[PDB]
Design a protein around this ligand. Structure first.
Ligand SMILES: N[C@@H](CCC(=O)N[C@@H](CSSC[C@H](NC(=O)CC[C@H](N)C(=O)O)C(=O)NCC(=O)O)C(=O)NCC(=O)O)C(=O)O
Ligand SMILES: N[C@@H](CCC(=O)N[C@@H](CSSC[C@H](NC(=O)CC[C@H](N)C(=O)O)C(=O)NCC(=O)O)C(=O)NCC(=O)O)C(=O)O
Lengths: 228, 228
């Protein structure tokens, strides 16, 4: 055996580390996965805050680059493509394209994750008796708004930037899957394909890619295994 | 007269465009400010969504670069320093430093703005009768948590990256000022300097810089002028 290139600190249920898992699989990069257990607050212990002072997953250690550490899922995506996507299979080369890819990543990080996450909190993930569908509705409406925004551009472009698949597209996949299957499933008649057909086209193209499909399957199995 | 380099679409009350205003003043760059009026939903009209399909401010037009447009406040900060900070007065040169500056920007964008904003919504900014201090408390606690995170690093470093002032630091200023003066002012005995002395040191150093002080003063005047 040989030590793998990366350690990815991930979680079975939480969406965010799976963006990085998807990219690592797409690029064929070697990595071990360590599930940080949020219930014993392992993520808030010195042993993990030494990697991320924010004490949230994911974080990535690059063992083949002097154990360099990066946290924030979308910064990790940028780190990986800058250093390990020299053919720009999932990224871009020109300044103009790079800054717009970054813009879309910031939109994902500030406008998708946090709001979709509040829906998740109030609907499904908060302790059962702290859940609250009324407050959740504010964030379900924000999910639909974000879907509307994505619809407005994807009806006229195949991919978010430079007419090619990049980490900008990949970064949205895990929370969109969570929204479609949980957060707005059954919400005011929500029907993904009918209501947001361009977003559905793009999302479907993403999740049917073998690396991304494999990532989603791995997540489902990891969740299942928690109760083994 | 001569057309200024940038149009910054801003708002008088909302914090986010002021990050960009601060950076433009720091660099001595020329810009006009257009306040988009959110009450007539001008930001959701074709005339503004043509600049930002997300329909939120800020957005920036670079008139001296073929009217190139960037939105997401923190992507705008990156755009400006990549193209117009060649001496790295507010940014960094090496890959290792750049990716960590980006990591901190992602932390600001996903972990400060959105959560501080939910506190703002439930406490102060939502329509008066939709406000809710109980739900707001969840986000006030998150503000203190983020302050704790910043405290844990700023007690041992002067600035977030590379031991020099960068847009990573600047990006946090406007929401921190909002939190200290509004969102957690009077919350469970909150005292910024006593409770988070390193964050207080760093924040104070930032807001006493003449460009940033001028930005804050300009914002206060613009707000005042709305009721003229
Ligand atoms: N911007 C960061 C967010 C990372 C993140 O949220 N990680 C979660 C696991 S994914 S699970 C999704 C996550 N929800 C939570 O973390 C729920 C608990 C939290 N403390 C709360 O009060 O909401 C969320 O809503 N995220 C918003 C987003 O993605 O921007 C975590 O470590 N939680 C441990 C903890 O917080 O103690 C990134 O992209 O890396
Ligand atoms: N990630 C973006 C956020 C930009 C943003 O929030 N812009 C606000 C003005 S600053 S005002 C701060 C803003 N609050 C709001 O925008 C309040 C109304 C909103 N629709 C809601 O329901 O909360 C907020 O909480 N932001 C979270 C963050 O900064 O990440 C806007 O245009 N609002 C018009 C609208 O939404 O219709 C950025 O950094 O550019």
């Amino acid at each position: 055996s040989h030590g793998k290139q990366f350690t990815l600190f991930n979680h079975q249920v939480g969406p965010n580390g799976w963006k990085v898992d998807m990219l690592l699989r797409e690029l064929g990069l070697s990595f071990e996965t360590v599930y940080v257990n949020l219930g014993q607050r392992e993520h808030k212990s010195p042993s993990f805050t030494k990697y991320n002072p924010n004490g949230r997953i994911p974080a990535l250690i690059d063992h083949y680059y002097n154990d360099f550490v990066v946290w924030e899922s979308d910064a990790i995506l940028l780190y990986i493509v800058e250093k390990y996507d020299p053919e720009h299979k999932f990224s871009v080369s020109t300044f103009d394209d790079k800054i717009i890819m970054t813009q879309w990543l910031f939109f994902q990080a500030s406008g998708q994750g946090p709001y979709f996450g509040q829906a998740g909190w109030f609907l499904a993930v908060a302790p059962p008796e702290e859940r609250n569908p009324t407050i959740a509705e504010r964030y379900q409406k924000e999910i639909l708004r974000v879907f509307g925004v994505l619809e407005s551009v994807l009806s006229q472009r195949q991919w978010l930037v430079a007419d090619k698949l990049t980490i900008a597209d990949i970064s949205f996949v895990i929370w969109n899957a969570t929204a479609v299957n949980l957060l707005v499933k059954g919400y005011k008649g929500f029907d993904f394909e009918k209501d947001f057909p361009s977003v559905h086209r793009w999302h479907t193209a993403l999740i049917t890619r073998p690396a991304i499909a494999e990532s989603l399957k791995t997540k489902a199995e990891a969740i299942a295994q928690m109760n083994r």
